[PDB]
């Protein structure tokens, strides 16, 4: 037993939700009490540039975006059980960090 926190971050949600889901399943058939997943307020990454490479023409703008979403999962489990879940639910889109 140990108070352990796991954070999931990515840019795309279908990849993010999949990693969130099956880990929760890993704590369903395993009788480990679970807190999470906590859907962090999404952070939109915006930068407003100018369309014109030169300075002629209409005043028109390009507003690109990135959406990054966070999921934090709280665990009460030994370090061995928490570690093996991540390598079972590893997938390239989401980075996995585990904090006790």
């Amino acid at each position: 037993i140990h108070k352990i926190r796991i954070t999931l971050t990515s840019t795309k949600v279908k990849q993010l939700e999949n990693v969130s889901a099956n880990i929760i399943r890993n704590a369903a058939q395993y009788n480990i009490v679970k807190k999470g997943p906590v859907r962090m307020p999404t952070k939109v990454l915006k930068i407003t540039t100018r369309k014109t490479p030169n300075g002629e023409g209409s005043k028109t703008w390009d507003a690109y975006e990135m959406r990054i979403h966070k999921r934090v999962i709280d665990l009460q489990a030994p370090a061995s059980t928490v570690k093996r879940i991540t390598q079972i639910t590893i997938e390239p889109g989401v980075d996995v960090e585990v904090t006790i």
Binding site: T9, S10, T11, K43, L45, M66, I68, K70
Partner: peptide, 8 residues
């Protein structure tokens, strides 16, 4: 930072 990590 998380913003400057996925950007990198």
């Amino acid at each position: 930072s998380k913003k400057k990590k996925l950007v990198a």
